[PDB]
């Protein structure tokens, strides 16, 4: 499996590692890839796309790297299963409600409720691992 994410300070990156840990504990292999190093073609061969990005700018997806990536794969993901996650600061998840609506609008099936954590996981570490376990059972 593959987990693609963008992280500015390391919060979403830590979530990605914990989600990966959950998948691995379930007995499956998984690779975490920063959005800057992804290969769209190899990624589209995956049955489930696991995507993460922190809340950036005015409650939007990170603009210089993550957003263009989403726009690039948008036309070729209809019917695919996707799991979304990310860290946020002062808001209440607006960017994620929009992200979920967007993915659904592209024809994707959002398999689980998006996982959002405020700031660094810390107390939510097990929640991240459990999310990976749910994804591994799909
Ligand atoms: C320029 C900028 C804009 C941000 N905008 C939002 C926002 O609109 N809503 C929110 O809750 N957090 C916002 N944040 C806070 C981040 O989402 C939060 O610090 C998160 O933990 C960062 O995770 P990361 O290290 O994975 O980037 C913003 C942070 C920065 C640097």
Swiss-Prot record:
State which residue ranges cross the membrane: none
Q: Which Gene3D superfamilies match?
A: 3.40.50.360
Q: Which cofactor does it need?
A: FMN
UniProt keyword annotations, A-Z: Electron transport, Flavoprotein, FMN, Transport
Listed GO molecular functions?
electron transfer activity; FMN binding; oxidoreductase activity, acting on NAD(P)H
* Domain of life assignment: Bacteria
Chain segments annotated as coiled-coil in the UniProt record: none
InterPro entries, alphabetized: Flav_short, Flavodoxin/NO_synth, Flavodoxin_CS, Flavoprotein-like_sf
Task: Give start and end of each Flavodoxin-like domain.
Answer: 1-136
UniProt similarity note: Belongs to the flavodoxin family.
Free-text function comment from the UniProt entry:
Low-potential electron donor to a number of redox enzymes.
The protein here is known as Flavodoxin
The organism of origin for this protein: Clostridium beijerinckii
């Amino acid at each position: 499996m593959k987990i693609v994410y963008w992280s500015g300070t390391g919060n979403t990156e830590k979530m990605a590692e914990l989600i990966a840990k959950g998948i691995i504990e379930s007995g499956k292999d998984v690779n975490t890839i920063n959005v800057s190093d992804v290969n769209i073609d190899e990624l589209l061969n995956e049955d489930i796309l696991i995507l993460g990005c922190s809340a950036m700018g005015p409650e939007v997806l990170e603009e210089s790297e993550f957003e263009p990536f989403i726009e690039e794969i948008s036309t070729k993901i209809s019917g695919k299963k996707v799991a979304l996650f990310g860290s946020y600061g002062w808001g209440d998840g607006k960017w994620m409600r929009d992200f979920e609506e967007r993915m659904n609008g592209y024809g994707c099936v959002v398999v689980e409720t998006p996982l959002i954590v405020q700031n660094e996981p810390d107390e939510a570490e097990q929640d991240c691992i459990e999310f990976g376990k749910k994804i591994a059972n799909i």
